[PDB]
């Protein structure tokens with residue numbers, strides 16, 4: 001289960017934590033984020049993330 005990192009700002013999307021503020025429950029894999037999901041810290045698109 002992969003952590004993904006925002007190439008713009010360095011925020012880490014952690015699947016074990018999800019992103020409740022965006023309606024993403026804990027345990028949601030990166031692949032299951034919608035394409036309109038954005039980095040909570042900098043606003044960059046999901047497609048700006050890379051696998052850590």
Ligand SMILES: [Fe+3]
Nearest residue numbers: 006009039042
């Ligand atoms: Fe970011």
